[PDB]
């Protein structure tokens, strides 16, 4: 059960998000090329480090 | 998402050979480059698809 350091590259425009949660674009800290979009609740800005568990799955709306 | 990117890129290849709505296709191509460039230069399988769509365009 490893842990993944990641960072927000870009917050996303018009997801139509239910509630204050936000779909965001992250790029890895280790495999910095591998960049996906995932789901984040709460206040968030661009360009900042995060910590996750499940990297393989792509987060939906 | 980047899982959808190769499907989109292949469709850009289809429109490139079957030329329709040229500025639309070019603009969306450039945009997906600038939002995914490092993934693009890091990947391997896309290189062939990019070569083909490049010839077509």
């Amino acid at each position: 059960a490893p842990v993944k350091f990641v960072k927000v590259t870009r917050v996303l425009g018009r997801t139509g998000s239910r509630g204050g949660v936000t779909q965001v674009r992250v790029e890895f800290m280790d495999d910095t090329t591998r960049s996906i979009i995932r789901n984040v609740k709460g206040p968030v800005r661009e360009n900042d480090i995060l910590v996750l568990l499940e990297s393989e799955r792509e987060a939906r709306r | 998402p980047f899982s959808t990117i190769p499907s989109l890129l292949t469709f850009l290849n289809l429109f490139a050979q079957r030329e329709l709505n040229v500025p639309l296709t070019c603009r969306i191509l450039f945009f997906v480059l600038k939002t995914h460039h490092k993934q693009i230069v890091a990947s391997r399988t896309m290189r062939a698809t990019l070569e083909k769509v490049r010839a077509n365009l």
């Binding site: 018009r14 139509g16 | 959808t4 499907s7 292949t10 469709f11």
Partner: peptide
């Protein structure tokens, strides 16, 4: 709904291809 709209539209187009 527009992004996922054109997304699964692309997906069905891939199936047809």
């Amino acid at each position: 709904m527009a992004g996922e709209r054109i997304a699964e539209a692309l997906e069905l187009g891939m199936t047809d291809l």
